[PDB]
Amino acid sequence: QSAKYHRLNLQNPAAAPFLESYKKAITVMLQLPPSDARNWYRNAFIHTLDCPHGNWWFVVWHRGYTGWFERTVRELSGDPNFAFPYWDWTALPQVPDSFFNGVLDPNNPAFIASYNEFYSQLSNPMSALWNSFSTAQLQQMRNRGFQSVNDVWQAVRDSPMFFPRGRARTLTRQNPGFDATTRRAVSIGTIRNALAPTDFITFGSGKTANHSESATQGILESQPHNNVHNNIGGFMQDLLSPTDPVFFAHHSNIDRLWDVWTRKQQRLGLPTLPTGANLPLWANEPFLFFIGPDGKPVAKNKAGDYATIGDFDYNYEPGSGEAV
Amino acid sequence: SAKYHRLNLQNPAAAPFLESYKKAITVMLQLPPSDARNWYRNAFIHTLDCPHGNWWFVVWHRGYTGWFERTVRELSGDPNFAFPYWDWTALPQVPDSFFNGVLDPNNPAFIASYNEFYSQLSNPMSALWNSFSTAQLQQMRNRGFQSVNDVWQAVRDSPMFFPRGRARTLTRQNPGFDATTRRAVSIGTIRNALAPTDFITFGSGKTANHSESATQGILESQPHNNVHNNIGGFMQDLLSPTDPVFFAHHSNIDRLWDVWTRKQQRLGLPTLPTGANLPLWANEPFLFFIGPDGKPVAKNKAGDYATIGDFDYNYEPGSGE
Ligand SMILES: [Cu+2]
Ligand SMILES: [Cu+2]
Ligand SMILES: [Cu+2]
Ligand SMILES: [Cu+2]
Description:
Chain A has 324 residues and is mainly α. Chain A is built from 12 helices and 2 strands. Chain A has a single domain (5-316), classed as Di-copper center containing domain from catechol oxidase (di-copper center containing domain from catechol oxidase, Orthogonal Bundle). The PDB classes it as metal binding protein. Keywords: Tyrosinase, Copper, Verrucomicrobium spinosum, PPO, metal binding protein.
């Protein structure tokens, strides 16, 4: 409800200055040395190393990642009111024309142009990062199948996760629209189906032992989230997706739909989180890789710490699905 | 080892089965709707009882496809008939063969409008409703149906029925899947769909009854759901079996279940839900299937359809083997 910061619809004319502030922060982070954890690519690699896909940690990990990166964009933009505008793809089933302007477009020549240059710039920092990992961080890497930083590079190079200049997205300014399947995935009918569940797991995707495992998926993850990623193409179709600035507009919308669901559950007098014995299993999952606006590792390193918007202190301009 | 063989619909040896299928469709469109093997009576089994978004997905569909295969076998007069499968991984488009004659639900042999559909099916479906057992009425209540008119409300208002010219969105000239659906049927997605080593992760989430929604496995959420929706018209809603291609689609889904089961057996891992989950899954009532004699079937729990069993078919191997 009452909050200091406001995540606006990116089509809101009042959001236009925040998109300029975002451009300023991207330009800064592309120009930070990759020894700085707020370097644009260092930021993307948090997602490669730690993001949950296909499990009940999906919305809560993304709340933490987006909430920390918002503070970093706020700091480096010099815009003390900054909050991430959301992409309401239900209203706008296309890459926003605004995200083809300047450094919101990852084809912009300010971005690293090739895998060769990316590895040249990021290999020494990522090796130094690996060598600094705690016992607990190396266990998370083992859970994810990474025995060394070169396992991370194998997945980047071979997937591929990095896309060269001209291929940073499949969708273009001239042809920005979703295909029929992705239009149905973001449709108001699908959004209502996504919000309909009355238990956290059915809403938020399946229970697993650790957040690097795959389980069954909820509608929110499997339809609008996954199909928007894949339809955009390029970085957005794989685990270096936060290289594309539109990633945070996408996740601002996902987090808004979580906020909608939570308030709907509260209205029905139903639980807002996993219940009984599931709650501590879900809350105690280690999230060990988030970076604050000072470039330092964050203290709050359990999933449970990110269950509520809490100290991130934002709310949303209401968007698609609010009336549920 | 099996008596019947579900072939790839691109196999030259499947071409006679596509003609037999056309003959059975023509017959079932011309059966009175008092006959439970009438084409529309058959589609309504799916509207009344199909699970979507839970662990009963593959097993209910095995039962429905297996019974309807026997009905097509009987009414075609082809004693070797088995449903050819649509390997959309190999053929990411509506097969050109499914735009020929009554394989195309735009064919004028089909009922052309909702008004005629209701006129033909309302009295039979009302008589059917009034014949339901306490147990069948409980399944209807689980699904939110207190009356046959709740079923018609869902048909009319969704809508589930599509008029002549709109029976599919994809056409003979433009039969191809969009980029998202091509990815959903891609070999990479098929391998991901087969990768799970537990039934629930493979076959979608546990629920208390089969009319409830849960989390979904890759098999259901990507290739199954996206092919339905990309085709459009009948295939995007719960009168989907009105489109003959429904059974070619479900022959491929059932093949991928067979592939998964044999992969599990090779790894020495479970082929079904385990422990306390197994009886919950096996004992779910499936009370609406119709035999090739037009009679209600005796095998009326999910557990009866866990194996191919006396349906007695195997597959020509396809994508993901
Ligand atoms: Cu992610
Ligand atoms: Cu994402
Ligand atoms: Cu179905
Ligand atoms: Cu289906």
